[PDB]
Design a protein around this motif. Structure first.
Motif, mmCIF file in Angstrom:
data_model
loop_
_atom_site.group_PDB
_atom_site.id
_atom_site.type_symbol
_atom_site.label_atom_id
_atom_site.label_comp_id
_atom_site.label_asym_id
_atom_site.label_seq_id
_atom_site.Cartn_x
_atom_site.Cartn_y
_atom_site.Cartn_z
ATOM 1 N N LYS A 243 0.937 -1.096 0.084
ATOM 2 C CA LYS A 243 0.207 -0.132 0.045
ATOM 3 C C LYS A 243 0.810 1.224 -0.087
ATOM 4 C CE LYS A 243 -3.930 0.009 0.200
ATOM 5 N NZ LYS A 243 -5.096 -0.251 -0.584
ATOM 6 N N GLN A 246 2.039 1.405 -3.527
ATOM 7 C CA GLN A 246 0.824 2.073 -4.346
ATOM 8 C C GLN A 246 0.598 3.359 -4.178
ATOM 9 O OE1 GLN A 246 -3.153 0.458 -2.914
ATOM 10 N NE2 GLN A 246 -3.903 2.096 -3.817
ATOM 11 N N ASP A 280 -6.054 -7.470 -2.526
ATOM 12 C CA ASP A 280 -6.120 -6.141 -2.774
ATOM 13 C C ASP A 280 -5.824 -5.765 -4.164
ATOM 14 O OD1 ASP A 280 -6.189 -3.509 -2.751
ATOM 15 O OD2 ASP A 280 -4.846 -3.362 -0.890
ATOM 16 N N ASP A 282 -6.678 -2.626 -5.373
ATOM 17 C CA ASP A 282 -6.113 -1.320 -5.670
ATOM 18 C C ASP A 282 -4.613 -1.372 -6.212
ATOM 19 O OD1 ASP A 282 -8.689 -1.125 -4.744
ATOM 20 O OD2 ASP A 282 -7.916 0.167 -3.026
ATOM 21 N N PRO A 323 -9.806 2.259 -6.756
ATOM 22 C CA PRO A 323 -9.574 2.549 -5.395
ATOM 23 C C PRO A 323 -10.264 3.526 -4.606
ATOM 24 C CG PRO A 323 -7.579 1.891 -6.592
ATOM 25 C CD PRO A 323 -8.626 2.389 -7.558
ATOM 26 N N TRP A 344 -8.526 8.387 -7.532
ATOM 27 C CA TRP A 344 -7.657 7.403 -8.378
ATOM 28 C C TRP A 344 -7.481 7.225 -9.890
ATOM 29 C CZ3 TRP A 344 -3.401 5.296 -6.042
ATOM 30 C CH2 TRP A 344 -3.380 5.306 -5.086
#
Ligand code: MN
Length: 582
Positions: A243, A246, A280, A282, A323, A344
């Motif tokens: 994350k 990301q 995930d 995302d 996301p 996003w």
């Protein structure tokens, strides 16, 4: 038997409903074919390092071996076996620089395991003894294994490579292998502690892959061979470090390139592992965009490219949800960051990245309090990034000394006079100060974070705080509250831009870029001297910075007073007219 990292079951790369994995695979088979017409790497020490040959052997072993395993064309296997056999006869793997040994061992480990049934008995024996005598045994020597007690990425890469080798030949050396696994499981906790508690990685986006990739080779191999990771994935913050990566790619699709990082992202194979283990998509949204962005050459070039398929071909890349979380923050960490976008959808909305930190950690610039501001497709406020080595390391060295008088901070691109933060009387930041994110909020009409920079400017100001906010998803505010010491001091509000600047008022700058305009509006202090500074160094060793200007303003502060600098970066649209609380 094919056991270590791409298990025979995990040949789910075979299914191709997915356009990414289809093209990625084809990029690998093309690069596998290109290494066919290429001679073996020789044993060349380049500046007391063999590392480049060791990565190339790993890279070629991964491609040829993955190619052979998916196609069957022994032209791939014969090539790989010729690489493995050539390097297994290297005198040593340069333990002087044990990363060389770690990556050569991993090459030998994966090759031996992926081509086991094809390769010959002479080369089975030869690799087994090579792994042991040139990889495993030197790592028992305290002349070479001091990384065992360090928390840097040498610990991740070396414990990873040595374990993979030991596991690849486990059945030939079971009790040595058991001692090595136990040692890796305990020693690798040291580097894994830098990810705690949120998954932040201090040196940032472009140094994260190397050690994290080997950390995951080690975990995947233990799960494959020993059936357990010994809880290594549970080390605090480690599962969330995807994350961090990301959100470290901002809305224009480029990195928050603080310190020596480079702004261009890449497809990050490790990312697909975290996406698959935290469930995930995302991360997949952000990785899909990096692929959308990447050139064929950079995917070919990257030594761990094959791992993207191995870890990612389990999940489909089509129809990824968007996301929804708009903010990612970490404060209890070496380089605190606050990473916010309004959407996003890349190249749309606004985004701001703010960083605290300390100059004493690795690959730092004097950039505490620095920020990135992107609007739509335009990074209005940027970071010059590094100036690469030896272009200064010939005459007047120690680019790596971190102390206050170091020549490092005297390079144009590395001190705070060239980043989006403050300076007092052209002085450098306190290289020993530490700053974090004291406060933030996710409020989608007023997203913000605050950094206390008091220790950053200890000899220069009694107190410094800075906030940044995205107001009503339309524009940005930067508010610095500065309590002065006993002397009049001229504060400089700096900002690095690629836009074309015009001072159009006594407290307004207007910037133009990409056919658009942005207002740099200065609401406080009352009298201010608007300014532009040349982004060209007076020193001939400092790289040139074309298309870049420094913009902002100067302000003389009164002693013993609480002064407030306040800037709004207003894009085009219909809004503004607001207040100045924080
Ligand atoms: Mn920088």
């Amino acid at each position: 038997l094919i056991m270590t990292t791409e298990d025979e079951s995990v040949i789910r790369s075979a299914i191709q409903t997915d356009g990414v994995w289809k093209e990625y695979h084809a990029i690998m088979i093309e690069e596998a074919d290109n290494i066919l017409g290429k001679p073996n790497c020789q044993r060349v020490i380049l500046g007391r390092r063999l590392l480049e040959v060791s990565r190339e052997c790993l890279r070629r072993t991964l491609l040829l071996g993955y190619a052979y395993r998916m196609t069957g064309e022994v032209k791939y296997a014969k090539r790989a076996e010729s690489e493995l056999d050539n390097a297994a006869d290297f005198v040593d793997w340069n333990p002087s620089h044990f990363l060389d040994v770690a990556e050569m061992t991993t090459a030998m480990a994966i090759g031996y395991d992926w081509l086991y049934n094809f390769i010959s008995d002479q080369t089975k024996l030869k690799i087994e003894k090579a792994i042991e005598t040139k990889g495993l045994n030197p790592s028992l020597d305290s002349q070479y294994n001091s990384w065992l007690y360090r928390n840097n990425n040498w610990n991740q890469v070396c414990n990873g490579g040595i374990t993979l080798g030991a596991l690849a030949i486990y059945d030939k050396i079971p009790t040595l292998a058991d001692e090595l696994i136990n040692r890796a499981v305990q020693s690798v906790k040291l580097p894994m502690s830098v990810y705690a508690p949120d998954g932040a990685y201090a040196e940032g986006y472009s140094y994260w892959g190397y050690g994290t990739t080997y950390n995951l080779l080690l975990i995947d191999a233990l799960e494959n061979v020993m059936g357990t990771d010994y809880n290594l994935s549970q080390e605090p913050g480690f599962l969330n470090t995807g994350k961090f990566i990301q959100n470290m790619l901002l809305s224009d699709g480029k990195s928050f390139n603080y310190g020596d990082c480079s702004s261009s992202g890449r497809v990050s194979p490790a990312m697909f592992w975290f996406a698959n283990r935290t469930a995930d998509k995302d991360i997949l949204w952000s990785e899909k965009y990096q692929f959308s962005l990447s050139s064929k050459k950079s995917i070919r070039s990257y030594r761990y490219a094959v791992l993207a398929l191995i870890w990612g071909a389990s999940t489909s890349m089509d129809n990824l949800p968007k996301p929804t979380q708009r903010m990612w923050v970490s404060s209890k960490t070496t380089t605190p960051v606050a990473l916010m976008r309004t959407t996003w959808d890349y190249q749309q909305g606004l985004s701001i990245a703010l960083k605290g930190g300390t100059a004493q950690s690795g690959h730092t610039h004097l950039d505490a309090g620095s920020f990135i501001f992107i609007s739509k497709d335009t990074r209005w406020s940027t970071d010059l990034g590094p100036q690469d080595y030896n272009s200064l390391e010939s005459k007047g060295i120690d680019l790596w000394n971190k102390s206050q008088e170091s020549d490092r901070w005297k390079v144009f691109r590395y001190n705070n006079l060239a980043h989006n933060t403050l300076s007092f009387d052209n002085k450098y930041q306190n290289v020993n100060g530490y700053a974090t994110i004291t406060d933030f909020s996710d409020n989608e009409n007023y997203m913000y974070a605050i950094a206390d920079l008091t220790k950053i400017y200890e000899g220069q100001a009694k107190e410094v705080k800075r906030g940044v906010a995205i107001v009503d998803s339309h524009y940005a505010a930067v508010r610095d509250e500065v309590k002065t010491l006993g002397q009049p001091t001229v504060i400089r509000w700096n900002m690095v831009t690629e836009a074309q600047p015009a001072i159009i008022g006594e407290h307004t700058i207007q910037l133009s870029q990409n056919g658009e305009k942005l207002l740099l509006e200065v609401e406080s202090p009352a009298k201010v001297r608007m300014k532009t500074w040349s982004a060209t160094s007076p020193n001939s060793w400092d790289a040139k910075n074309p298309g870049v200007t420094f913009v902002g303003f100067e302000a003389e502060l009164r002693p013993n007073t609480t002064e407030v600098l306040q800037v709004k970066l207003i894009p085009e649209g219909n809004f503004d007219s607001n207040k100045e609380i924080m």
